[PDB]
Design a protein around this ligand. Structure first.
Ligand SMILES: Nc1nc2c(ncn2[C@@H]2O[C@H](COP(=O)(O)OP(=O)(O)NP(=O)(O)O)[C@@H](O)[C@H]2O)c(=O)[nH]1
Ligand SMILES: NCCc1cc(S(N)(=O)=O)ccc1Oc1ccc(F)c(Cl)c1
Ligand SMILES: [Mg+2]
Ligand code: NA
Lengths: 166, 469, 167
C-alpha cells in the first residue's frame, strides 16, 4: 500500500471540508463550520492499486493565512478549490498556487483545479476561464459538487494519479 | 533570529526542551516521552500543526491526565503574555511618534495567533470527536462553554462563534451514493412472511447482505472510549464497552446459530444441504468484504460439534471444500493472510475486531506508563501513539457505508436470533456436542439413518444475483 | 531443521493473563512490546540442550468471542491454562477450559500445564496448596508466575515443552 499525502486548499467557504467529508463518509455537511486543520485517512483502490490517502483539510479563513507553510511542506499533491458562484475565490487561486510553488521550491507540484458547488445554477465563474487557468498551470480542471457527489472521486483520484506519475 | 519568549516563571510552556522534560524518537519530530506540560506545548506548537498528534492525544490522554486538568492546562496555554515595548519603540514613544512595534507584531502573528488557534483546534476536536468527556461530566462542559464563550478579540472570533454553536448542537444530538443498491432477493420465504424465515428459506444472497448491513452497523458504532485502557476486559465492561460487547455477542450468536442449524439437521442429505448453504453465505460475505461474517462461518465449521462430522464433509462439493479451506487459511499463522487481504481490498468492509482487541490489550500491558530519565518521570507517549494507531485503523474502516438496501423484516429476524434460548453457555454447547455424537457416532458405532425434517425444496437458488428490468 | 511447538495460552480475561507471553517473548531486559510485529510470538529457545522454536498463540482480549475458542484451541499441541491467584472465579474456570481442550483435541491426555499468575499486589485468594491439589487431580504440572518480575515464566513454558516431548 502506497501512502499519498493530499492537501485541500482554497478560500473560506468554497466547500473544502464538504468535499472531503463527502469523499470519506458519503455524507454532505450543510453546516459551515470554519476549519482550523483536520486530517482524514482513506484506503481505496485506484487504477487497480490499493493505496492509503492522507487528506489534510485546511483553513480558508484569512485569519489563518500566516500558518500555511507548515502544511505545504508536508503535502505531496494539492486540490486547489474555488466555488463557481464566488469570483473572489477564483481570484484567490493564484495566491495558493504561488505559495505552494515557493514553499516546495518547485515548478512541478501535483495539483488539480477544482470548481466546486456545480449543483448551483447561479454560476459566476465560467468553465472556460477556469480551464484557461488550469492549462496555464499544466493541470486538469474538474468541476464538483460536494452536495450531489458529482466529480468528487474524479477530483481526488486524479490528484492521486498526478502524484503517482510525478 | 528566533522570537524571544515569555519568562518561564510567568508562562510555563516557555521552558527550554531538555532530556529532563521531553524525549524525541530517532519532517516534524515524533515524541517518545515527555512531561504533560511538554506534551501540551507540542500539541499546540507555534511552528507546525500536527492533526495526527491531536487525535492521538485526545484519544489516549486520560491514562495520564484527568479531563478537568487537561482543560485547565490548555486554558493556561492559551493565555500568552505579550512582550513589552523594545528600545526602538520606547524612543519613538518618547518623541511622540507611533512605535513600529515590529517584535510585538511578529510575536502576535507567529507565536500567539498560531498557538491560540491550535488550542482552539484541540477544543474543537475534543467536542466533535471525544464529546463523551462532557456527557459524563456536566461541569467540564460548563467550563468549556465559559472558556470558549469569553475569548475576546477579532482574530479568533470566527472559530469561537463556530465552536460555541458546535457545542450547542452536540448537546441536543444521511448517506448519498451515485449508484442504486441492488434489488432485494427472495427465495422460498416471500416478503412479509416472517414466520417462515429460516436458513434455507431466505435467499442466501440476502442473508449475507442483511447480516453484512447489521454487522457493518455494529462495527461502525464502536468508539475508542470503549477500547482505551482495555476497559472491555475489566469489571465495568458492560458500562464502558456496550457497543463493542453488542457486536461480539452478535458474532457469537450467529456462529452458534450456524452450528445449531447443522447439528439439529439429523438427516445426512439435509445436513449436507444446510452446510452447503452456509458455505454459499460465506462466499457472499467474501464478495462483500465482510470479514467478520467470513470468520463467523469459519468459527462455526471449526467448532467441536461440526468439525467432527466426517460423513457430511465427504459429501460437500469439492469447490465448496476449497472455498472453506481458503477462508480458513486467512486465519492461519496469526492471521497473516487476513491482514494482507484487509489491507488490499476496496472498502466498504467489515473487519474482524478480535485482532485489534488483542493488539490494544498487549500494547497496554507490555509497555510502561512512564519512562524514568534523570530522576524525572516522563509520560511514555510512544505507548499511547501505538494504541492510537490501532484505534485510527479501526476508525478508517468505519467511514465507508455499504450500498445495500435494508430489508426491515430480515433485519429484525437476525437481530432477534437467540439459538441458546434460556440455556446457559455450557449447557447449550454440551447439547450441540451431544447432538453431533447422535447424528454421527464415534467409530466403531454404526451410522444411523434419520428422517427428513424439511418439507420444502433443498436446492439452493445460488449466489449470483438476478436483475429484472 | 529444529522442532516447532505450537503452544496455546487459555484462561479468564481481565486478570493479567497476557503478561506471561509478553514477559517470555520480550526483550527480557527492556520493558517494551509491539504485538503487531510479525513474530512477536515466536522465540527460539534451548530446552535441556535441544534447540527449538516456540510459536505461542495468546488471544488475550478476545475472551468474549467464546464460539471461536474451539478453532483457536485446535491449532495447539500444548496448552497453558492460566488463572490469577487473586481471582477465585478464574481458578474455578480451569475445569471447563481443560474439558474443552480435551474435547477439541479428542484426547484424554493433552499436554498442558496449570499456571497461577500473580498479576498485582491485591490479596491472594487461591492458595498454592489448592492449585497443587487441582493439578495433581489432573495429572499435570503446576507453575506459579509473577506478571511483574518474570519469575516462573520460563519454567511455565519449558515445563509445557517437556510435557509435549514426553507425551
Ligand atoms: N450547494 C452546495 N453547497 C456546498 C457545496 N460544498 C459546500 N457547500 C456549503 O458551503 C458551506 C461551506 O462549506 P465548507 O465545506 O465548510 O467550506 P470550507 O472551504 O471548508 N470553509 P473553511 O475554509 O472555513 O474551512 C456549507 O454551508 C456547505 O454546506 C456544494 O458543492 N454545493
Ligand atoms: N476433516 C476436516 C474438514 C474441515 C475443515 C475445515 S477448515 N480448517 O478447512 O476450515 C473446517 C471444518 C471441517 O470439517 C467439516 C465438517 C463437516 C462439513 F460439512 C464440512 Cl464442509 C467440514
Ligand atoms: Mg473547512
Ligand atoms: Na477472588
Amino acid at each position: 500500500m502506497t501512502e499519498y499525502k493530499l492537501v485541500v486548499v482554497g478560500a473560506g467557504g468554497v466547500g473544502k471540508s464538504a468535499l472531503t467529508i463527502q469523499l470519506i463518509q458519503n455524507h454532505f455537511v450543510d453546516e459551515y463550520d470554519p476549519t482550523i486543520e483536520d486530517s482524514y485517512r482513506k484506503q481505496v483502490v485506484i487504477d487497480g492499486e490499493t493505496c492509503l490517502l492522507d487528506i489534510l483539510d485546511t483553513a480558508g479563513q484569512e485569519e489563518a493565512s500566516a500558518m500555511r507553510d507548515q502544511y505545504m511542506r508536508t503535502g505531496e499533491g494539492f486540490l486547489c478549490v474555488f466555488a463557481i458562484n464566488n469570483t473572489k475565490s477564483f481570484e484567490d487561486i493564484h495566491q495558493y498556487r504561488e505559495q505552494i510553488k515557493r514553499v516546495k521550491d518547485s515548478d512541478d507540484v501535483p495539483m488539480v483545479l477544482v470548481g466546486n458547488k456545480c449543483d448551483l445554477a447561479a454560476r459566476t465563474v465560467e468553465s472556460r476561464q477556469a480551464q484557461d487557468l488550469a492549462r496555464s498551470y499544466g493541470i486538469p480542471y474538474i468541476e464538483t459538487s460536494a452536495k450531489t457527489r458529482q466529480g468528487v472521486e474524479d477530483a481526488f483520484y486524479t490528484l492521486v494519479r498526478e502524484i503517482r506519475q510525478h | 533570529g528566533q522570537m524571544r519568549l515569555p519568562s518561564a516563571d510567568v508562562y510555563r510552556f516557555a521552558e527550554p526542551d531538555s532530556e529532563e522534560n521531553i524525549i524525541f524518537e530517532e519532517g516534524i519530530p515524533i515524541i517518545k516521552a515527555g512531561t504533560v506540560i511538554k506534551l501540551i506545548e507540542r500539541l499546540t506548537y507555534h511552528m507546525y500543526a500536527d492533526p495526527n498528534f491531536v487525535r492521538t492525544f485526545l484519544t489516549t490522554y486520560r491514562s495520564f491526565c484527568k479531563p478537568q486538568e487537561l482543560l485547565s492546562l490548555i486554558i493556561e496555554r492559551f493565555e500568552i503574555p505579550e512582550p513589552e515595548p523594545t528600545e526602538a519603540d520606547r524612543i519613538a514613544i518618547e518623541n511622540g511618534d507611533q512605535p513600529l512595534s515590529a517584535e510585538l507584531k511578529r510575536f502576535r502573528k507567529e507565536y500567539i495567533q498560531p498557538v491560540q488557534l491550535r488550542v482552539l483546534n484541540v477544543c474543537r476536536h475534543w467536542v466533535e470527536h471525544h464529546f463523551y468527556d462532557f456527557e459524563r461530566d456536566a461541569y467540564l462542559l460548563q467550563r468549556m462553554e465559559e472558556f470558549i464563550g469569553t475569548v475576546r478579540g477579532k482574530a479568533m472570533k470566527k472559530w469561537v462563534e463556530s465552536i460555541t454553536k458546535i457545542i450547542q448542537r452536540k448537546k441536543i444530538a444521511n448517506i448519498t451514493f451515485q449508484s442504486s443498491p441492488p434489488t432485494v432477493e427472495w427465495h422460498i420465504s416471500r416478503p412479509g412472511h416472517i414466520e417462515t424465515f429460516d436458513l434455507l428459506t431466505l435467499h442466501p444472497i440476502e442473508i449475507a447482505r442483511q447480516l453484512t448491513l447489521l454487522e457493518s452497523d455494529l462495527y461502525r458504532a464502536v468508539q475508542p472510549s470503549e477500547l482505551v485502557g482495555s476497559v472491555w476486559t475489566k469489571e465495568d465492561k458492560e458500562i464502558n464497552s456496550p457497543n463493542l460487547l453488542k457486536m461480539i455477542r452478535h458474532t457469537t450468536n450467529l456462529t452458534l446459530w450456524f452450528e445449531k442449524c447443522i447439528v439439529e439437521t439429523e438427516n445426512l442429505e439435509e445436513r449436507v444441504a444446510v452446510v452447503s448453504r452456509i458455505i454459499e453465505i460465506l462466499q457472499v460475505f467474501q464478495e462483500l468484504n465482510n470479514f467478520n461474517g467470513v470468520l463467523e462461518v469459519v468459527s462455526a465449521m471449526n467448532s467441536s460439534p461440526v468439525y467432527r462430522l466426517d460423513h457430511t464433509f465427504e459429501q460437500i462439493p469439492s469447490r465448496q471444500k476449497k472455498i472453506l479451506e481458503e477462508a480458513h487459511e486467512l486465519s492461519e499463522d496469526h492471521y497473516k493472510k487476513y491482514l494482507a487481504k484487509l489491507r488490499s481490498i476496496n472498502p466498504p468492509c467489515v473487519p474482524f475486531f478480535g485482532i485489534y482487541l488483542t493488539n490494544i490489550l498487549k500494547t497496554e500491558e507490555g509497555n510502561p506508563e512512564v519512562l524514568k530519565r534523570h530522576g524525572k518521570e516522563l509520560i511514555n507517549f510512544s505507548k499511547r501513539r501505538k494504541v492510537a494507531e490501532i484505534t485510527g485503523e479501526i476508525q478508517q474502516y468505519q467511514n465507508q457505508p455499504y450500498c445495500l438496501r435494508v430489508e426491515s423484516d430480515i433485519k429484525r429476524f437476525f437481530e432477534n436470533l437467540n439459538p441458546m434460548g434460556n440455556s446457559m453457555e455450557k449447557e447449550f454447547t454440551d447439547y450441540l456436542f451431544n447432538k453431533s455424537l447422535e447424528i454421527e457416532p464415534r467409530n466403531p458405532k454404526p451410522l444411523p439413518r434419520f428422517p427428513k425434517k424439511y418439507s420444502y425444496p433443498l436446492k439452493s437458488p445460488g449466489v449470483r444475483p438476478s436483475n429484472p428490468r
